[PDB]
Symmetry: C3
Subunit: 397 residues, 3 copies
Amino acid sequence: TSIHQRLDRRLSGFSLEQPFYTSPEVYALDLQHIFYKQWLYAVPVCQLAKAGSYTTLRVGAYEVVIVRSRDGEVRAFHNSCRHRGSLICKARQGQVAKLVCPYHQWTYELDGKLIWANDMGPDFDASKYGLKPVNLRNLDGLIYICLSDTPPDFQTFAQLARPYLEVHDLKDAKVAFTSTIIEKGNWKLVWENNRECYHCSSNHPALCRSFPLDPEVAGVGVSKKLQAHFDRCEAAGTPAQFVLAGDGQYRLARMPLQEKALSYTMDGKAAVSRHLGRVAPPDAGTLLMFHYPSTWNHFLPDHSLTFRVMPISPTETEVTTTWLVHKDAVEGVDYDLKRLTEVWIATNDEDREIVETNQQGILSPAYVPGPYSPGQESGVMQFVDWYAASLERALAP
Amino acid sequence: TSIHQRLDRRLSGFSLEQPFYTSPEVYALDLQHIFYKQWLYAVPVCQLAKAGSYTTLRVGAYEVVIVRSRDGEVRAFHNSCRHRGSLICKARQGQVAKLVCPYHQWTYELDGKLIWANDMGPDFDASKYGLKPVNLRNLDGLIYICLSDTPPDFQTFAQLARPYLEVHDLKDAKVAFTSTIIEKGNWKLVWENNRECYHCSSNHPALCRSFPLDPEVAGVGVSKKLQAHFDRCEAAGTPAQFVLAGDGQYRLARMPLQEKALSYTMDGKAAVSRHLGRVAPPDAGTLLMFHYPSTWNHFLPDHSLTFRVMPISPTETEVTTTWLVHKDAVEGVDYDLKRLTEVWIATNDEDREIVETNQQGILSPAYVPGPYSPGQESGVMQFVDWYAASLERALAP
Amino acid sequence: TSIHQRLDRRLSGFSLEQPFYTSPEVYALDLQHIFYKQWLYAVPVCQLAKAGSYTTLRVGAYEVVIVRSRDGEVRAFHNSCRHRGSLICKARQGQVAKLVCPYHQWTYELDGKLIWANDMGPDFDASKYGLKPVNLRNLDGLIYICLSDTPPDFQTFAQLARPYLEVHDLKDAKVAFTSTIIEKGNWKLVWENNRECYHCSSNHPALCRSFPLDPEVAGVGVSKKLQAHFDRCEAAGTPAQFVLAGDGQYRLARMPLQEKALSYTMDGKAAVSRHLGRVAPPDAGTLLMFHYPSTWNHFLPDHSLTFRVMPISPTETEVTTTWLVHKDAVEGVDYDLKRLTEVWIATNDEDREIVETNQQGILSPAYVPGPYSPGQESGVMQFVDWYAASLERALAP
Ligand code: PRO
Ligand code: PRO
Ligand code: PRO
Ligand code: FES
Ligand code: FES
Ligand code: FES
Ligand SMILES: [Fe+3]
Ligand SMILES: [Fe+3]
Ligand SMILES: [Fe+3]
């Protein structure tokens, strides 16, 4: 049975046939046609504070390095020396004056240009051997990248998102904490787990203290209560109302939290007393933003969290959660690290366990697609449709 | 060279060509056509003492859960939720009132029926989404399962075995100890090592204290001495005589132990003073039972041992040894754990080492089939014939 | 794209296209057509001091055992029992009277002949089941082996090398220390790193104390200074001048060390005060010898080092460094272990890091061949040409 036959018979209301989650062949397609073609969230721009600042990340097999150039611009490059291929930047992050390959010291300017290569002979044209660039966008303090030489349109999304994101002043953030975990499940299982709160009341004690179980929230017809919340927000100049991509790729919405909760904390109060951004009112709740296939996000009035999904192998996915707070917020004074992070560290561990347990069942040959819940899992259906549709376009001659 | 060509030129008196032991392609065939089609030993029924008792096990990629239902029946099921596939029972064993998937709490009755699924909408037919059953037989206190929807005939074997097994009262046993090890050799190498005692006098000091080296014993024309033993047994009402399957799949025989030995112990005396079953005479020796591809077994007058062979990968096999004793036998009083187990724990470690060393040599491209010993390894020849024959039937259009 | 197309478009002055370094398909070809067909360095003969001495090693999947026979001859054999395939010698090295398989004790004489096999029946012809021999050459105290039944010509190389090697009296050495490491890079990346000192001044602080950075040295038109050194050597009866194989497979040359340095030590003085061999003058420098695909070597006046390259997987290579000193040299008296070894232990660690970092960049799909330095990396070009040419001959119908 071919991939085309599997996609042809796929019905929208059901989880995917086994190979989509477990086969190396579908993983190769997901990499080639999804992760290698769409725009991807990489890191907050505040990680590249000073010029010479760099951060590295792997995308599938690609080795990418992101650096802040001399001119103040942020640029991305393939982290592979044009000489014999070596990684140039081995550390996760750092600062340098120049990009100097540790092998033979071919030296690049922070804009990728090869400015010195020892003893290469008279016929060497350095202009042909600068670092290969990687398409990059700055989404209001959040760095996105695209590995395709023919990137899809980012602008529609950026323009739609700017109003919602700019009120968080992400450019003025610092990273208060980063958590990187590996979940032993296909990247799609990670997203499907993320696009429903069908599993929340049983699996997320801490999260449920502040994050609503309403399917309307964590999922994908605006109710009265919700529109009322949108209104308080927007009356205060804080964009809030539902926005969904034409093609399902992204969604933004500022949702209310559980009664009285202001933030993702055990007591429900703000985690940080010096807010990141100018969100109003204090109880504006959480701006949810997703953008397939790479990222979901929770921007709160006091602090923000980005999540980055990166594929490791058919049955492994790296999830990186970044807590953003105001750059002048002081740990121990303006916030407490444990108190800031504990809820989502626990929620993440609980999701990992769940995803991995899901994956283990799926690996049984007895596993067959099952029906998603119309009322609790329409967001899951929504993601799978976007996924299949994307896969089909890419596979079309 | 195809599998059909390899099987076509195979001569019975020789070990198999390399790929049978080391290739992923033969492993896939062994799983599909052997482990997924034949009956397999799973666990003693005494592990499912109370209703709501369950135990889980993996067979190849299949995730199986075995549970004792409300009606006192023992049933097996695919351990994959009909919603989105998750394992329902994560622990190795436990008790529950209901099968409740930890993901979204789809809840099943202990007979597999879906009795509650949250918010699935009016068009949801729970009768279509009960757990998938797994064929199950109870062989006189030993649970066997078959992953095929068209199971082979178990009854011929069961009827032949009942007389030999029933005198052990396995229904009244408890598990005194379980040992699970992984041997780094193809599952067939584990069986070939098991079907001869050609290697015993050099590799098994402890075992050799009580278990005879006679090829007639551990192997596959009844001598005088042996028939005499069969006779003492059967004169005492204890079935003993050789039984071999028409097609070689199974064999039963109650063999004498080394002079004076009554059990698998360092001193040769009984391990347990409260016997499991009603075997007579005291020196009835050991009932050997094998059933390809899953199990060999030693039932003694005082206690019994089952062994379960499960494939992990082309070059890994899980062997699970279960010591059964009478349910009222008291550890520290009626038997001593170390004394009960030490012989076969050591024998198992020694076999693991041997199998792994065998496998390592076999992985050399220089390895070619070699001649089995007619007198010491006819049981090995017997197993390989059953194996090849099984493979050929399954491959026949 | 086929291997033939990749080889067809390959230009000599560039590093290889990705799959040569990372694909399982090229790894299978390298094993089949290179490592399994060419002569390979195994161990110094002094490791087989006494009769019954043996040493074992893996070559790709092949399991080889090398033993010193009763007649004083050194022979090699496939380390797989002719019965059911088991390794016969499990230890890395040892002594035995006979080769006795630990499984069923089939017993071989040290020349491979099967002299005893228990109970194999009247139709058993032991003459058909002796250990399979492995072609073996003794290169003046260095044991080489060839896994092909139709070995290439070793004699041209041996005759060319004898004059250079014999003055080191390798037959009179002992192993003072062995270091085995795994580098996470393709075996070709290990060689390319070895065939240039383009990376030396930045990566090898210790080595650079005594080993010259002149490309003429570590690389592949004899300058005045160098010929002068050749002359001092050969005037003293010590062969020194450049020898390169017709087909690029091997090279020998006795190069001068850094000003005043006599050996690979932190202080530059001799490591051992009792010299191995009769090299003269004291500052004769280092005899470099390479032989693709298995070995590079540094023979100094006081002691010698062999390096053995063996493939582990597409992206892993085992490098084994052996320090040879005179058999009567006494540790703690005639040399200090740390002082003898520290330079090349560090150099090796530094190379491992470099190779692994090279490999990591290469695994990016963005990696493309790049230009080798004509003046610093002609030795690299030389190795890659030998490699491609070898691969092409072997692939020719
Ligand atoms: O339970 C969680 O953690 C995520 C939040 C959005 C939907 N599910
Ligand atoms: O040696 C052993 O442990 C097994 C027992 C039956 C044949 N070989
Ligand atoms: O740097 C090193 O260690 C090796 C020596 C020969 C060429 N490169
Ligand atoms: S690989 Fe970067 S300088 Fe050689
Ligand atoms: S997977 Fe079992 S309830 Fe959703
Ligand atoms: S495998 Fe060597 S004696 Fe049986
Ligand atoms: Fe969750
Ligand atoms: Fe055994
Ligand atoms: Fe080096």
